[PDB]
């Protein structure tokens, strides 16, 4: 049980860590609404 507790539990928190590695992508994509899309709105200002 010590091998789980010390290692494999951490390995399954590492399974759990996929969120806390992909939220990098997801939240920075949230930040693309300020950025890539956001700049496009700020070009729709000029169009208007």
């Amino acid at each position: 049980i010590t091998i789980p507790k010390n290692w494999l539990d951490f390995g399954w928190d590492i399974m759990t860590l996929d969120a806390r590695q992909t939220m990098d992508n997801i939240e920075t994509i949230i930040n693309e609404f300020p950025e890539d899309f956001g700049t496009m709105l700020k070009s729709i200002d000029p169009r208007a």
Partner: protein, 49 residues
Amino acid sequence: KKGWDILTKSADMFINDLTSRIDSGVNDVRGFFTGLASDLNEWGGNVAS
């Protein structure tokens, strides 16, 4: 955003042009109103003669 007014600020001006054709163009109170002095020299010169 700065420059993207230009091509319709000109569109304010494009009737500032047509209205120029009123005051600089076919004006009355200046222009035609010269008759209301030159006619008085025609009549004046004629009546005096």
